[PDB]
Amino acid sequence: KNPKSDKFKVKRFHHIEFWCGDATNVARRFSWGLGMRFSAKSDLSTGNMVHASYLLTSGDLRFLFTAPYSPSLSAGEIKPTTTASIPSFDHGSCRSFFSSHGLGVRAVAIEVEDAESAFSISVANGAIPSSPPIVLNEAVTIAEVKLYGDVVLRYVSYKAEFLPGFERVEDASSFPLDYGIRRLDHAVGNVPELGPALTYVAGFTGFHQFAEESGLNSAVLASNDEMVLLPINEPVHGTKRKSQIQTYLEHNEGAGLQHLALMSEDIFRTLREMRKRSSIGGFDFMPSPPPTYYQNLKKRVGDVLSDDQIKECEELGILVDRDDQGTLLQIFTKPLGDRPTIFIEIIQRVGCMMYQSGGCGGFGKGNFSELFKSIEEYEKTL
Amino acid sequence: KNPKSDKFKVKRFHHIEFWCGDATNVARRFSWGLGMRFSAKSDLSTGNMVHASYLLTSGDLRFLFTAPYSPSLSAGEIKPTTTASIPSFDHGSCRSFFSSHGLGVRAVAIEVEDAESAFSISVANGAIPSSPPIVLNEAVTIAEVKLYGDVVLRYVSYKAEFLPGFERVEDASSFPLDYGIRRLDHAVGNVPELGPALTYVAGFTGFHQFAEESGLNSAVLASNDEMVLLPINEPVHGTKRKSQIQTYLEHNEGAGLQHLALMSEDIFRTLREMRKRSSIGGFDFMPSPPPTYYQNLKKRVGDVLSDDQIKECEELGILVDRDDQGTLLQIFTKPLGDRPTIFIEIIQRVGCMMYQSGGCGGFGKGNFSELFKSIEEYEKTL
Ligand SMILES: Cc1cc(C)nc(-n2c(=O)c3c(C)c([C@H](O)C4[C@H](O)CCC[C@H]4O)ccc3n(C)c2=O)n1
Ligand SMILES: Cc1cc(C)nc(-n2c(=O)c3c(C)c([C@H](O)C4[C@H](O)CCC[C@H]4O)ccc3n(C)c2=O)n1
Numbered sequence: 001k002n003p004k005s006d007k008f009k010v011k012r013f014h015h016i017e018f019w020c021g022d023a024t025n026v027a028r029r030f031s032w033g034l035g036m037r038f039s040a041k042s043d044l045s046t047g048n049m050v051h052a053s054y055l056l057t058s059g060d061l062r063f064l065f066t067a068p069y070s071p072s073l074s075a076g077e078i079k080p081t082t083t084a085s086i087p088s089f090d091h092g093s094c095r096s097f098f099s100s101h102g103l104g105v106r107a108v109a110i111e112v113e114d115a116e117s118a119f120s121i122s123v124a125n126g127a128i129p130s131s132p133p134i135v136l137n138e139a140v141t142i143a144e145v146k147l148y149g150d151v152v153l154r155y156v157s158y159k160a161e162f163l164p165g166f167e168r169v170e171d172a173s174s175f176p177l178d179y180g181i182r183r184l185d186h187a188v189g190n191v192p193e194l195g196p197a198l199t200y201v202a203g204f205t206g207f208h209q210f211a212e213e214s215g216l217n218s219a220v221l222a223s224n225d226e227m228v229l230l231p232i233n234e235p236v237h238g239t240k241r242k243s244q245i246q247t248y249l250e251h252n253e254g255a256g257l258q259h260l261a262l263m264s265e266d267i268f269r270t271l272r273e274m275r276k277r278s279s280i281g282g283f284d285f286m287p288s289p290p291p292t293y294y295q296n297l298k299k300r301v302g303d304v305l306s307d308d309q310i311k312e313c314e315e316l317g318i319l320v321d322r323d324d325q326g327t328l329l330q331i332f333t334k335p336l337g338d339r340p341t342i343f344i345e346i347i348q349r350v351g352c353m354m355y356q357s358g359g360c361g362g363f364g365k366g367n368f369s370e371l372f373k374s375i376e377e378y379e380k381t382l
Numbered sequence: 383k384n385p386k387s388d389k390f391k392v393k394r395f396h397h398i399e400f401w402c403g404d405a406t407n408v409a410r411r412f413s414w415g416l417g418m419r420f421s422a423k424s425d426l427s428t429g430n431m432v433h434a435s436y437l438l439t440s441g442d443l444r445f446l447f448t449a450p451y452s453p454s455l456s457a458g459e460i461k462p463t464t465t466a467s468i469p470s471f472d473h474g475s476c477r478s479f480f481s482s483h484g485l486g487v488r489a490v491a492i493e494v495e496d497a498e499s500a501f502s503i504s505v506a507n508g509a510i511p512s513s514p515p516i517v518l519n520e521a522v523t524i525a526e527v528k529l530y531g532d533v534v535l536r537y538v539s540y541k542a543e544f545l546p547g548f549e550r551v552e553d554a555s556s557f558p559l560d561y562g563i564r565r566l567d568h569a570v571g572n573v574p575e576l577g578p579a580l581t582y583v584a585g586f587t588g589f590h591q592f593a594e595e596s597g598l599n600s601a602v603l604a605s606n607d608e609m610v611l612l613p614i615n616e617p618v619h620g621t622k623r624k625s626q627i628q629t630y631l632e633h634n635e636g637a638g639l640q641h642l643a644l645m646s647e648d649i650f651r652t653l654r655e656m657r658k659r660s661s662i663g664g665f666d667f668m669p670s671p672p673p674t675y676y677q678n679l680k681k682r683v684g685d686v687l688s689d690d691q692i693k694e695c696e697e698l699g700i701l702v703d704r705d706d707q708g709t710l711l712q713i714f715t716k717p718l719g720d721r722p723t724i725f726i727e728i729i730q731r732v733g734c735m736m737y738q739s740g741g742c743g744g745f746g747k748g749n750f751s752e753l754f755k756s757i758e759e760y761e762k763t764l
């Protein structure tokens with residue numbers, strides 16, 4: 001069931017903004033590790049005395065990395081005279097976020113039909129305002145409401161190239177890296193209590209519940225065409241192994257974004273390229289499932305994947321799940337930074353052709369049982 | 383003249399510590415960009431609840447990257463019960479340093495015969511104490527005094543593997559990168575007033591002055607065998623072009639470390655490898671001198687470098703200077719992070735064979751005039 005109850009017209013995920021201590025070093029690391037090109041900038045060289053912001057892109061995926069300069073460079077400015085290209089930016093909010101949470105996602109940005117109306121309707125329906133609608137160069141409108149913790153849901157709408165005040169990046173600095181990642185599939189929050197978090201967010205968006213012992217409860221909120229997908233997790237206490245959601249909350253100092261799932265047009269090539277770079281500046285992946293997991297794939301998805309394609313999943317540590325509608329290939333990175341908090345998921349979906357409907361195959365919930373069983377079978381085998 | 387007036391026995395540069403917002407991302411970026419291997423760690427996986435510290439090495443060059451965790455993880459600790467592996471670390475000092483200065487060098491560490499005696503003699507001779515001598519596992523002693531700004535001169539001495547509490551890094555995480563960098567040649571501070579800075583540092587070390595219109599005055603302090611080299615710069619005001627030292631002080635919020643000069647055993651190979659990676663996660667270099675500069679090298683160092691070796695300098699943007707004792711090959715990176723503050727110099731020295739004496743060829747002061755003249759000649763040519 002999809003009641004299509006969005007209270008305002010939502011299009012697609014637009015970008016993700018990380019708040020950083022040094023945007024240059026995080027952006028260069030992510031660019032090499034994920035195969036994302038340097039696409040735009042707003043910094044001292046573009047007249048921005050307030051913050052350094054660098055945009056990486058791969059297909060439709062947009063990762064923004066932002067850090068504050070010394071407040072002294074902009075001390076004579078006021079908001080009417082600001083040189084910041086992102087008017088919601090605040091030195092104090094950014095420093096406090098990073099000191100509290102470490103490196104992580106400040107903004108989950110979605111493109112909407114009209115950011116001013118989305119902001120008003122959201123707030124009229126319970127959203128806590130964070131930054132009011134601001135029109136940039138009579139061209140782009142941006143507004144922000146609280147999502148969970150210190151993460152904001154950012155609305156952006158365009159009259160008709162990222163944002164005014166950003167400059168497109170010089171070719172020599174723009175190496176055309178590409179490992180096959182094409183768009184953001186979903187963005188996942190960890191919270192202490194799932195119920196109130198869902199009620200808040202579904203309350204002000206109209207997003208509906210998407211139909212779907214290991215330490216979490218989770219549910220997924222979705223827009224009308226189910227292309228904006230926002231899962232939310234809560235911990236389950238008193239288990240044998242401590243909940244990874246609770247470990248997140250402790251190290252993150254509370255709720256925040258847990259993982260970003262990036263859709264690849266070729267998850268085999270993406271993982272080959274990412275794994276080649278894991279130990280030379282890139283990202284590391286979680287430990288691979290045992291061979292028993294891959295023997296069990298024949299019975300589960302042997303009608304979807306060939307023996308060679310299953311063996312390729314085994315070589316790359318790829319996990320596989322399946323819905324009543326489709327099939328899911330997924331893998332998780334180790335944490336992106338110092339703290340055991342945010343990580344990345346790489347994903348590719350098979351099925352649900354109509355274009356492919358959003359969330360085809362689910363989110364991998366079936367792999368909690370399949371991993372456990374396969375680990376037990378492997379332990380008993382040896 | 384070398385009076386050999388060190389007040390305590392100094393050996394060599396030991397390491398450089400960067401204070402970071404996220405140590406993981408800076409260390410991975412530096413590793414790929416400079417060809418430095420992941421050598422040791424002290425973090426949550428080693429029992430450190432206080433800070434994440436990662437060590438990169440190339441030859442004798444040691445770069446340490448350190449960031450604080452949430453204070454809540456260590457809130458029940460006291461200094462007698464600390465899990466920090468670096469006892470001078472303080473969450474508040476680190477957060478304040480980074481918020482004030484951005485990414486940069488907190489500690490210039492030198493290996494001494496006895497860190498407790500070096501600390502006592504330094505303080506008895508005017509050094510401002512920063513962290514008292516602390517003996518780690520009855521094996522290593524560490525102590526810190528202020529150098530300039532918020533940069534400390536760290537003393538380390540060994541009874542007889544980086545520091546106790548650090549673990550050597552697993553092979554799979556340790557990719558054996560190497561672009562030829564072998565040791566730290568010198569470390570340079572920017573200060574508002576050179577005179578008092580020199581008098582302070584030379585006062586408590588006994589380091590002597592090393593014998594050597596463009597916006598700076600500078601002088602170099604050196605240990606007895608002149609293998610520890612600490613240049614210090616001050617701005618010169620009222621010039622045509624604004625002093626780069628003054629721009630540093632403004633963006634850094636005061637004095638701090640300006641550049642680290644890394645000696646390569648093969649500066650041609652180092653620059654080839656670094657430039658291949660500039661736009662895929664590595665470091666960018668300053669704009670190359672005009673061809674007139676390289677035509678002028680024949681008259682200056684044609685007895686030192688062949689035509690092919692001069693043409694190789696031209697291909698790589700390498701600068702060349704010469705002493706009465708030796709010849710200097712050098713090049714500078716763009717700033718390492720968001721702010722136009724710290725950068726890196728790659729260097730290789732020819733001559734002064736006895737081993738090679740420290741500082742052979744000077745520090746490139748002759749290239750201020752040579753660059754200007756060659757730019758004027760190139761402008762007139764076109
Ligand atoms: C090393 C380690 C330690 C622990 C405690 N769990 C794991 N782990 C996962 O984190 C994991 C995740 C994050 C997902 C989804 O992506 C999420 C969806 O987007 C939203 C719905 C629920 C979310 O879980 C799916 C399966 C997972 N499976 C099987 C798993 O085993 N891995
Ligand atoms: C783009 C740009 C803009 C400006 C204002 N200056 C430059 N520049 C330099 O920064 C530069 C530096 C940093 C050095 C040494 O390494 C230092 C020694 O270690 C200590 C003694 C003095 C120190 O200068 C040598 C020559 C330099 N030359 C010729 C130059 O032109 N480059």
Ligand SMILES: [Co+2]
Pocket residue numbers: 186188259261345363
């Ligand atoms: Co997921």
Ligand SMILES: [Co+2]
Pocket residue numbers: 568570641643727745
């Ligand atoms: Co130098």
